[PDB]
Amino acid sequence: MASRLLLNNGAKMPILGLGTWKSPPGQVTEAVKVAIDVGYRHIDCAHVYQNENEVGVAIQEKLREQVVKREELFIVSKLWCTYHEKGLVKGACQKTLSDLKLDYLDLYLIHWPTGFKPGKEFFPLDESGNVVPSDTNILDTWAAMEELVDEGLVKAIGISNFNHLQVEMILNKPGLKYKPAVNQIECHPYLTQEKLIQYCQSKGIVVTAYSPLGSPDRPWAKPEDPSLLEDPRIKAIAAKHNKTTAQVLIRFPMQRNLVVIPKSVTPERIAENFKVFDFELSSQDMTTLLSYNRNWRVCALLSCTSHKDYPFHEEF
Numbered sequence: 072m073a074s075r076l077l078l079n080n081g082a083k084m085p086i087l088g089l090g091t092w093k094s095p096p097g098q099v100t101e102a103v104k105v106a107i108d109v110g111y112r113h114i115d116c117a118h119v120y121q122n123e124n125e126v127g128v129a130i131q132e133k134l135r136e137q138v139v140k141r142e143e144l145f146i147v148s149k150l151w152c153t154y155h156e157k158g159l160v161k162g163a164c165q166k167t168l169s170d171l172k173l174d175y176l177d178l179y180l181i182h183w184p185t186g187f188k189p190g191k192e193f194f195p196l197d198e199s200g201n202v203v204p205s206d207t208n209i210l211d212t213w214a215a216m217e218e219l220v221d222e223g224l225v226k227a228i229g230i231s232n233f234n235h236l237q238v239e240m241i242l243n244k245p246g247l248k249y250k251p252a253v254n255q256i257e258c259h260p261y262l263t264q265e266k267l268i269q270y271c272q273s274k275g276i277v278v279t280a281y282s283p284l285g286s287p288d289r290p291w292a293k294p295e296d297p298s299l300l301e302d303p304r305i306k307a308i309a310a311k312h313n314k315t316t317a318q319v320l321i322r323f324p325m326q327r328n329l330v331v332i333p334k335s336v337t338p339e340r341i342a343e344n345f346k347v348f349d350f351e352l353s354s355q356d357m358t359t360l361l362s363y364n365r366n367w368r369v370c371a372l373l374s375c376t377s378h379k380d381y382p383f384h385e386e387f
């Protein structure tokens with residue numbers, strides 16, 4: 072299978088990338104160095120992860136050492152919710168660039184459709200605990216992203232956690248300049264996303280699947296939660312192919328024409344997660360994995376459920 076797919080800005084995106092959410096700042100530099108050494112060309116980052124400086128240290132070292140060329144890397148980041156105001160977008164992007172030590176991003180995503188009140192707090196709360204919204208709508212934030220493209224700061228722009236109506240809102244924006252190149256959404260056998268994926272792909276929007284392993288390190292994990300990596304049905308499929316369960320879970324979205332971004336700080340797993348290009352899941356395997364859908368979410372953005380733009384009320 073090809074290592075990259077074509078986006079609608081004319082650029083190629085590596086279908087496998089390294090996730091950084093929850094990667095401790097003390098381990099993430101090594102994690103990214105190892106990833107690049109073992110063949111990863113695509114790194115998924117966010118300002119809200121508060122690790123971008125350390126990730127940047129890794130990228131910069133690998134560039135300086137000429138292990139890789141900048142043009143061979145695909146570096147993605149995301150605009151946090153407290154930055155949706157038009158006057159804050161450029162600055163947010165520039166802070167991310169400075170931390171990553173880059174002069175451009177290959178892809179910059181609106182992290183969530185929900186804008187929040189600007190300030191130091193990433194999740195500003197009222198006295199009663201609800202998130203305080205921004206009055207900036209998704210379409211104006213989109214115009215600000217487009218400006219980032221026209222200023223040379225980012226090669227492509229996209230969205231994340233947009234439901235199909237919100238994607239539709241962007242595609243229908245009056246005077247729309249650039250279409251979203253990507254929608255990055257949670258996807259795995261317990262949330263299969265057939266509808267949203269089909270819609271985006273029908274529009275020429277590439278989908279990136281996050282939490283492909285079910286995010287076993289998520290802070291809110293509970294024992295009664297389903298566990299992909301421990302699912303004996305999935306372990307049986309892996310066993311049949313002489314691969315690991317994680318490898319199956321990574322190959323799964325690839326064969327759906329999705330980009331996938333498993334996260335690890337463990338060097339051995341970083342390497343293991345990358346050799347997915349040497350085997351194929353059967354159509355039967357694929358349909359079987361799809362049959363496991365429970366509509367179960369790792370990231371439900373639970374503090375935002377009353378936000379006018381909360382993505383997950385809608386079926387898809």
Ligand SMILES: NC(=O)c1ccc[n+]([C@@H]2O[C@H](COP(=O)([O-])OP(=O)(O)OC[C@H]3O[C@@H](n4cnc5c(N)ncnc54)[C@H](OP(=O)(O)O)[C@@H]3O)[C@@H](O)[C@H]2O)c1
Pocket residue numbers: 089090091092093115116182231232255256280281282283284285286287288300315317318332333334335336337340341343344369370
């Ligand atoms: N746009 C968004 O809103 C959004 C939301 C969530 C995630 N994301 C992106 O998607 C990335 C991946 O999602 P995620 O971090 O939620 O979780 P994930 O990639 O599904 O799972 C990461 C967890 O799996 C473990 N793991 C990795 N490889 C393994 C293997 N081969 N065998 C066993 N365990 C393995 C990791 O452990 P170690 O790290 O200890 O090895 C870590 O605890 C994130 O890092 C982030 O970049 C984006």
Ligand SMILES: Cc1ccc(C(=O)c2ccc(CC(=O)O)n2C)cc1
Pocket residue numbers: 092117119120194290370372374
């Ligand atoms: C209670 C609470 C509130 C907010 C967070 C939080 O900041 C959060 C939730 C999901 C994610 C991953 C992503 O959006 O990429 N983050 C970074 C976590 C926990």
